[PDB]
Symmetry: D2
Subunit: 310 residues, 4 copies
């Protein structure tokens, strides 16, 4: 497999590149940056190679500028982590829709691939990448409410005193304040947490608000999330690599699977495999959660229109 | 961690010895068998060693007989996979086997006993009584194996990676299972809230699970790799103190409806101290009743093999 | 990746199937046996599925007899473990088995043939000829396993992790082995330079490495976990195009001292396309002479089975 | 296992915390920082936790400051990545004097709390490891640094990218100082176990150029990206794994010598060390060639001079 990370010079880009080179199935890895940042990537290449030596891993890392994206040909996934530093949730959306749109257009002129969008707003940037690439919807997806579901997993596991991996929850909709945390998909060991001791003392609304404000807290404290997002990305790349056909949650295009909702890219239950988003699974939603998903689809559609012509 | 396997010459025993030797935490593995089978273990130690050479692993594998169980001293866990393949007959014969091994082990050291011998929910109770060990240290691999088989059948009907399925079965490792369809979820999403669940043949699936052990015994001769890997998950949770909610044959002292004096498959939080608590999950109505029925039948068998 | 295991009902074939399904790249695994063992395979498929559920792995296992080998088409690799277990007579018996299998596999598709049947060098040669496959596509697990056994012996005498040891044995998987002390290392450090090499019983250890197969057969009934894990390493090298310098039974076409028309254990670069290169390392005169003798006997046995 | 990373707010420290949290044997991870960097660690703990949610891992990350180091009590290892940024206007002696006080104060206060292993990453790593062993008054088997091992992995990268081989198939050793007095052991350099002198095309290996590159690779990574993080962090994890699972592996680390090599004593320098549950369990005295052994004597002499220069800091 060959994966090209556009934005490898950044925080998430560099972490994703190192974790990706370690991945056994990743043979070739193309690190793409703006020409000015290319030296930062040279030092990433060296650093990653050193880690590969101390990880019993190997990869052909390959550092290029963004000038000619023909270096991404043969790549099965092009992870776009490139984003301007932040200026509202709409303003950065116009700047980053410019960036992601140009990257998707040029990538599509060069080859056919799966575009993994990490730039924020991730649902709007995934929609912009799909629009400008003219790629089929199975090929363009963004890491969205999955990172939120991982932060939720942490909160639940720490409260219930279990290995973080034993918790498995799902949050759909916008990677933002209009999240739709599915408490019916929240379980420790496959057992719904409502049926577990002390769920009555679980501060769910506090925990969900904290989950919503965790990205901001990490920006304010360290300067931005890097390892959490990067690990979440390696999961998706591994699913695509080994055709694992897994029910995951990704920002993908809806075309009537869930309540006839179309013309948007939002967090949805999807079956990921070698062909990207193979199907948007229409999981049965409670009435209150389905309403919240409709609302997040409304806000995301408004934002998507504000950058459709960018 | 030092783990001793009693019955390593068997199907499950040899598979579990190879897998445990590969585990990084396992530093000392003590294989044990009847003297008449000790040579089969001497070969096993060799073959596993070569496997360790080709898996980047290392382990100090000692091979001994069951005549001096002092070799199990220092064993964090002792996995008893020893036993012969009439139900009350297998419970009585394997109860002599497991009870003797537990008594002798308890005279050597204070370890945790992982009973794999069948009837597992009864051999686990026999091990606990004949050891006098604290309840938290004796546990058995019961409904967990059945839950992995159910996991397979679901993951194939719904066309997902098996590991995206996560289910749970409680009660007896036997025809009185209590499968928790309310605790069956793909991606955390209950199957009841998933497309095509209507056409999921739950009843056929659970019946095939009930007899999958007998069908492997008929086709291959006995479950070897499935049971072994299931053992390694428990050994890992104990070694790394993962404090995970699993399902094991464990002693009940009233955590679930005052049910006591029974070792049965239950939700248990497992860590460095074996069974750390019997978590009383809120069961459904039909489920809790099939669980009291499984506790009833299992208590019958435990009585039938108490004077053994 | 799709791999077919021809001979999966066997001891080695079953361990190889369980480990191959557990691998993340193996998406399809086609287990093939004679009709008389097809049921044994359908319980292996079940048993492995149960392990895959307990190993967070998944795969699509397909069980078929050897009657119609069209079930192997699409395989990147076909691992032939089918073979009468254990001299020249065994070569003839298994040359018929391997020759017919390679003939019918080559009539079904073009694939890589990983040959485990013994005499592995001779059987790899017979597979190459009877399939008319390219020489980069046919290879066997030969002296690599001897090197892993030498690895165990060295690591134990020197008190180091088994994986810290790295040695090379070339030539035949047998009594014409050519152990290369010049390549035996610990941490990359040649063992001669290490402390206490003067006390290492090299000749006794190599004699033991040669007879280790015979001893595992006498004590347990045949090697399975060692050879299976070794096979996994080779399959993984192909599946990830690791381009690792390994030792495998491969066809020589003059890379080493103009030695040709033989499939013998040699240093090769394994990758996506199989034997990408036979690397002619600098062998001492003594080692090279032993390699020439080994090649001689292997060619004698290869001629004795040239029409079988 | 409980590992305390002092200096986790940095590049090496944060990378190492993330990897250690993922390690299955790490149950407690204590991240320590200056009081002005504690927020940078509370963001780190969160980020790593999210990573542990997406890596099927779990750990109890506790975030404290360097004021009270009674928080590291119970640690099997304390990895000190604390160090000053090497500004261009800083000599070797200047950074040695600056980081000798940092490492010495941390060693003294960590010893006042408990008895643990001190994994020194701060450069000059040999001199800092020596200062930490001295000011901790610990057993010499318990204090050890990451030195020529990283230079060895970089040599491995340069070898495996020249010979067209997987990186892990190359195994080489560099002993001596994590610096210009390095002693690369071409005797201990191999591919698949085959010494590389016995390999096709060793004639054209630019070994001397390669070694000068491996000697300046850290400086180049600093110039380009700002400092290595993943290389040293992964190497650190390898050492922690050998200690935790008692693998008894022959590694190369900065360790104290008490005569194992030609009566060379009173120096923490890069040497072959069998690492296990008890840190440096033996300094293995491998048979170095004459030129190699002279170069090692030289590296020891220079490192002893650096140590005398920071003996009273
Ligand atoms: N929803 C999710 O899952 C998450 C999404 N994110 C998003 O991912 C992005 C990456 O953030 P992060 O990497 O942490 O921060 P960085 O700012 O460190 O990454 C910025 C990267 O984007 C590149 N870049 C900046 N401006 C432009 C431009 N005008 N044109 C092209 N490339 C440009 C930078 O190159 P240079 O080196 O020249 O600056 C650098 O490669 C952010 O947009 C962030 O919002 C963040 C966390 C989680
Ligand atoms: N808990 C679970 O989910 C499962 C448990 N099992 C149970 O575990 C046991 C092992 O099954 P399996 O290994 O597959 O079958 P095997 O018969 O292949 O293994 C038998 C093993 O038990 C030992 N053994 C047999 N009889 C005695 C005896 N009288 N005293 C002491 N040791 C003895 C044997 O030693 P020797 O070779 O010397 O006879 C050998 O080690 C069975 O009781 C089986 O029912 C099996 C599968 C599922
Ligand atoms: N070089 C290596 O690394 C090693 C290679 N080996 C070799 O591999 C072979 C298998 O070893 P092992 O599995 O332990 O032996 P087993 O006897 O345990 O299994 C034999 C397997 O070979 C198949 N087989 C036997 N005879 C025939 C035949 N006439 N036609 C087709 N298939 C046949 C069997 O099918 P069925 O089940 O129907 O009988 C079964 O699949 C042996 O030849 C052995 O020498 C073994 C160890 C080390
Ligand atoms: N042994 C090897 O091969 C390698 C060694 N290193 C060495 O390890 C150290 C860390 O490198 P790196 O993390 O990349 O550099 P950074 O500057 O990125 O991080 C420096 C770290 O050291 C801490 N620190 C700085 N000054 C002091 C002080 N006076 N007292 C206590 N803590 C302090 C910082 O905390 P704050 O946030 O307050 O600044 C921060 O945690 C350096 O000394 C470097 O030379 C690095 C790589 C390889
Ligand atoms: K890789
Ligand atoms: K081990
Ligand atoms: K698989
Ligand atoms: K951990």
């Amino acid at each position: 497999m060959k994966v090209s990370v556009i934005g490898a010079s950044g925080r998430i880009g560099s972490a994703v590149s190192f974790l990706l080179a370690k991945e056994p199935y990743i043979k070739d890895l193309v690190l793409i940056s703006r020409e000015k940042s290319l030296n930062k990537l040279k030092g990433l290449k060296m650093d990653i190679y050193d880690a590969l030596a101390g990880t019993r891993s190997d990869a052909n890392i390959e550092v290029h500028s963004d000038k000619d994206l023909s270096v991404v040909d043969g790549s099965d996934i092009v992870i776009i982590t490139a984003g301007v530093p932040r200026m509202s949730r709409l303003d950065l959306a116009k700047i980053n829709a410019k960036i992601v749109g140009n990257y998707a257009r040029e990538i599509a002129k060069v080859c056919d691939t799966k575009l993994f969008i990490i730039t924020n707003p991730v649902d709007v940037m995934t929609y912009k990448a799909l629009i400008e690439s003219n790629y089929e919807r199975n090929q363009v997806f963004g890491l969205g409410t999955h990172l939120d579901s991982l932060r939720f997993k942490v909160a639940i596991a720490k409260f219930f005193g279990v290995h973080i991996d034993d918790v498995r929850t799902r949050i759909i909709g916008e990677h933002g304040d209009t999240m739709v945390p599915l408490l019916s998909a929240t379980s420790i060991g496959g057992i719904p947490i409502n049926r577990l001791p002390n769920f009555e003392n679980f501060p769910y609304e506090e925990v969900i608000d904290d989950v919503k404000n965790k990205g901001k807290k990490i920006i304010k404290l360290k300067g931005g999330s890097e390892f959490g997002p990067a690990s979440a990305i390696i999961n998706i790349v591994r699913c695509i690599a080994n055709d694992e056909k897994r029910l995951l949650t990704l920002s993908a295009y809806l075309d009537g699977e869930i309540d006839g909702i179309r013309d948007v890219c939002i967090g949805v239950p999807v079956k990921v495999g070698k062909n990207g988003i193979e199907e948007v699974v229409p999981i049965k939603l409670e009435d209150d959660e389905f309403e919240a998903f409709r609302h997040s689809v409304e806000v995301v559609k408004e934002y998507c229109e504000e950058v459709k012509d960018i």
